[model samples]
Target: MTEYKLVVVGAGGVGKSALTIQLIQNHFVDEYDPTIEDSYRKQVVIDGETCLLDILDTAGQEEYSAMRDQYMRTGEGFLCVFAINNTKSFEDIHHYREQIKRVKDSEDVPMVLVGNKCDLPSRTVDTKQAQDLARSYGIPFIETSAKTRQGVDDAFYTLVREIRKHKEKMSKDGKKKKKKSKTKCVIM
Candidate 1:
């Protein structure tokens, strides 16, 4: 069994928790509070590939900073979220990226930038700014909507594919030390 640790982080009211709920359980939370802390462990089988996904949905509050860091350290990958309808959330992406880099200390690990709340067009943040930020950070970016399920699976599955690719490369490169031996059995 392979376990993949992931963290969803963003500013308040950016739909981090909502996205997690929708992706993990296929349900939506209509009245979710952005300041609340939550965590979930979900098992997903994608294209006959089973993976244990453990997600930490950190609160978008200053008081939860320490808890967020703790969770961030455990994550193999991060889904840095921002709200398309909120400019501040989009602006905070840089801050989140900095914090993640400080803790994770590995730019090689995959970090995805997700612009949430795409179902609403009236409250959109600058798409150019989002694209520029993602480009500057060298991370994959996607716009997702929990309400409409746009790019929802893409956001998660892209990370999975990246991780799997990394693992395969590591195995091939001898970075992952594993031994394979054949067992002999006698049959009548």
Candidate 2:
């Protein structure tokens, strides 16, 4: 089956792993694990196509910077997560975005701006604020409560859709380049 390698990234204490677990297991993980690195796989149908989603839950702390580049290079799409209750976590999303783009060496990488932990009673990051940030980043924005399983599937499914669109666009570009090359190769 086709596979989509999706990376979950954000600041420490954000619900990256929680959101991931919710998607794969249909339940929430309440403990704070400070994930070093974990891979979870699940087979599901998205838009009528059966595929495997290989999700990478990585460390959010700066000390794990060494592993960031490795996953960033291989991840086909990303869920840039942040906790709505923590302003710093929301701000840190920028660095993660920049790092992913830098590591991939491409500005058009498939990614979703996710505001997690929305089930909290209070939030430091506003909805429109996150919405504007996503607009600037040129990616879709979503708010999820891993505790309640809200928007969990949408986040992952959206990323897969983004990856599909990106692949289609890339193949189209390749075909255009190929056609141009063929014309240039014609005998003088």
Candidate 3:
């Protein structure tokens, strides 16, 4: 049984917890924002292969990159989200992506850009701006409303599929590199 870590990150109060609550919201947390982490199971069948997906929901209360660097290193795939209603949250996504890439030491790290809170009656950050931001990074982007449960599945499913493919490819490349480094005996 294969298992993957799916980390959901975003600006504070951007419904990071709301999305989790829809799936794992039965429980409760503390009053202060201390980066509470929870794991919920999601069974994924990607390309006809069955696997377990562990969604790690974070509080997103941390304002510093040091903590993110740690989480970024452990995460297999990342979903960087923001509230379309809050323009600053949308702007903060660049920091999230930068920290992930820096900590993982790879520009090819599996990632998805998300603009959340589409249910709001009015949005300060429009779809075109969000799409352009995602396009700049060359990653997939989707808008989700945790309230209506729209586009949430598509965002996670697409990310997990990419994670599986990236992991498999990395493993194959690693094996080839390992084999090349071995000493070959040349008997005369």
- Residue 119 of candidate 3: its Cα lDDT? 81
Runs with alpha carbons beyond 4 Å of true place in candidate 3: 24-36, 60-70, 168-188
| Residue 40 in model 1: lDDT | 88
Assess every candidate by TM-score: 0.76, 0.80, 0.73
Tell me how many residue pairs clash in candidate 3: 1
Between prediction 1 and prediction 2, the one with superior lDDT is 2
Per-residue lDDT, model 1, residue 15, is 63
Task: After the best TM-score superposition of candidate 1, give how far the Cα of residue 12 lies from its true spot, in angstroms.
Answer: 1.5
Those runs of model 1 whose alpha carbons end farther than 4 Å from true positions after fitting are 27-29, 61-67, 166-188
Consecutive 10-residue window with the lowest summed lDDT within model 2: 175-184
lDDT of 3: 0.70
Over 4 Å off, model 2: 27-29, 60-68, 175-188
> Per model, how many backbone clashes are there?
0, 0, 1
Best lDDT goes to which candidate?
2
lDDT by residue (8-107, candidate 2, tens digit) is 7766666566667656776446655666467787777888899878787766456456566776787788877788888888788887777778767656
Candidate 2 structure, TM-score to reference: 0.80
Q: Write the per-residue lDDT of candidate 3 for residues 1-188, one digit (tens) a residue.
A: 56767777657666676676574453554323334566577767777878777776766455466755665577788777778788788778777777667767656788777666788877898778777766765566888876666677788788887777787778878745654666788899
